[PDB]
Amino acid sequence: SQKNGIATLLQAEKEAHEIVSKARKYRQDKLKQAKTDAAKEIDSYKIQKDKELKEF
Amino acid sequence: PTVQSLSERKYSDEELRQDISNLKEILENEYQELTSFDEYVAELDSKLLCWSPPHVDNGFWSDNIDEFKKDNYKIFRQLIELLQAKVRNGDVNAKQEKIIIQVALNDITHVVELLPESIDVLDKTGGKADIMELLNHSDSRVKYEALKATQAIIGYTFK
Amino acid sequence: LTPNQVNDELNKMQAFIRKEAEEKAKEIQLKADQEYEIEKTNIVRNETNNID
Amino acid sequence: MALVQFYIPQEISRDSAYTLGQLGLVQFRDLNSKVRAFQRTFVNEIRRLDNVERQYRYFYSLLKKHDIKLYEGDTDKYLDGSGELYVPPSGSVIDDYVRNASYLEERLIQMEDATDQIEVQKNDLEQYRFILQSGDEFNIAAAIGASVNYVTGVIARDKVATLEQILWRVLRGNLFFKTVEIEQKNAFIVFSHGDLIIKRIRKIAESLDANLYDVDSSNEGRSQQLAKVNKNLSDLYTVLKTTSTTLESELYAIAKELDSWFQDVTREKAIFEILNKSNYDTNRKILIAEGWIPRDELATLQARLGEMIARLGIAQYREINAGLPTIVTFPFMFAIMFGHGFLMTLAALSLVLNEKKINKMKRGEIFDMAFTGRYIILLMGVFSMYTGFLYNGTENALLFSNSYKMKLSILMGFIHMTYSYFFSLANHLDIIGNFIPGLLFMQGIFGYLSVCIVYKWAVDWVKDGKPAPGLLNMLINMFLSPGTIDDELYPHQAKVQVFLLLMALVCIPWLLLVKPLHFKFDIMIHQVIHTIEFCLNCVSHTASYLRLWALSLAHAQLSSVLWTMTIQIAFGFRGFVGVFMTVALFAMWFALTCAVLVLMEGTSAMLHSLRLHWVESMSKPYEPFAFEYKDMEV
What we know:
The structure is cut from a larger assembly and holds chains A, B, C and D.
Chain A: H1 2-38, H2 41-55
Chain B: H1 2-8, H2 14-32, H3 36-46, H4 58-68, H5 74-88, H6 96-114, H7 119-125, H8 128-134, H9 140-155
Helix pairs in contact in B: 1-2, 4-6, 5-6, 6-9, 8-9
Chain C: H1 3-23, H2 26-51
């Protein structure tokens, strides 16, 4: 029964490495999502300062 | 030491080796980033001696030896007067005086072994007599540091 | 020797390797969220300095 | 349970798992180096091997600095007493074991260098203090200031001082002296010269094999310098005493830790090779499995490491058939060549208790291998006394004792020859073959020759004779079909030689014919080479039996000649001449008899060689030699 579970453990190690590769891919995509979600914040402070400059 | 020994025996995960290698550079450069004269003057002025990564190097005492010499070696006479004054008031076989006696014996051994002109300050001040008696007491690591400090001044006497 | 001990040992080893793989897998996004928030705060301060 | 890992090729994993199962093991499952996250090809195993090499170099430097010998033994199991103390049952830590040895060696090197420098400085100042104090006298007259110049120095020979005084007196005028002082080894010299020629005297004194300077000690800033030299020599003795006590306490406190650290570094270095982190180990042992073993069964499983399996902590035949009949056939046939066997049993039994002390004595190369095989020399030495006591039946003349001892080795070797064929026929269990034809022609010829030798000793009345018997009947037989027996054979009536020749001639086709029937449920050349090799070995195996009776009769004649030639001369000339001549003749006779018995015991390896090659060829290698000593041990 070792010859049937040996390939299941060998594929289970590759799936376990693939899960960490998927988590590293999501962690790598989280920086691009943070930069894309952070690059738009300058327009609200620029328009908020322009509203305070237009009010003055 | 755990980061340096753990840096050689890395794991399968790259995040552990990148975290240990990233923390080892900031931990090693954190103590090396400070000045030896401000650390030695702050530790000697604060009256608290302790070991560090840059305190066991002979280059710090050799670099601060010329800057410390301003009153005929008054800085080394103040450190030897702090070690001998700690030896008289607050006698050995104590927890507090053992660290300052060991660090003052290592720094006095490195400063005495660095230049041969600091031996006159120890004989003029009077801390050279307590260095020979401090070796025969307990704390044999501090007795080995005082044995190296007495061997450094004893090496310049006879060649 | 027997196949039941190898089947139980491989069955425990596969579940332990899978649970260790997922439990070691969650920390990448668990630190990546705080890293993305720190990068967004740094970019927001970098834009707010020139805006001010 | 204790996690164990083994590495070997993927060809004998079924045979390697049987030894671990018989020695204690459960949950044997085959795996690879790409399943778990703790066994794969990584550089961490090479870095741990480099850290184990640096820890081995630090342990070698600490062992060399400790003044102790290098530790060894290969202690890896926990069943023994010293293996449990020299090997921890917990996990392996390379950094914690490396830092505890590097931290001790880093202080031990500075303590040894400071102790050697303080001892050299204290020996120099103490050596120069007595020279300065002795030279100052020849009361303060020369060490406190004067108008004359003195030259003090130590020298190991007065001839160099006489030649330097003759050269200085001949080449520089009367500017020398003549002084001699005994010292502790060197001699104190006393030279005097002018105060304006001290620079020229340094080159001639240094070039004359001497160190005659103005001042021996390096303390001359006051009057006198011996007071400061007595203080420096009074503090250097205390600093050298404290450094010697701290160095002795450090080496005595670190010697056992380094000795256990070497044994832990052996298994820690073996764990890196068991991890398979190198590309060369992947193309050598492709099979790597794991199993569960208990703590109590880990000692018995770690005692025997199988044939090629690597039993990790916390010629591979085991049962048959390599050395089964060699344990009885080896010492019994080897002891027949050697009562003379009492000295071999006493010398063999004397090394039992003294094996540990005799292991480190370093005396001889054959005595060490005899001390390792104590059970073989004890069994063969004990069995040699029985057959040796019978020869040295009786023997009083020539051609009387050799007629029975010559025919005794044929019947003695025939039982081992039939036992080797029965042991070879028992193995491999149509499903059997290649052994029914063997021992049929030699069993008939040698069976009728042994039967004629057995019936020859009963031939009384006259229908008997001793020409020789044995070889004479077999030599006369097989050359005459019409005859019956010549001589001393069973006369019933003539058909014994016809049945023996028919059974020996019928074994020719049955040998090669029985190979394909026994092989099944390139064989031609193997059957022809096995037929010619069996035909040559059948005559060579029976022909090689003469060395036991030859060496036995030669040793018995060589012992009885000296004993019969010394016993009569020992008892003659009564008085002091009988005690002195009997003591010297008995001492020289026993001294030559011990060397003759050691020469026969050293020359008795023909049964081990012929039993190792010829007996091992038809039975199945060096597995029977280790299997014979391992049989009596277990």
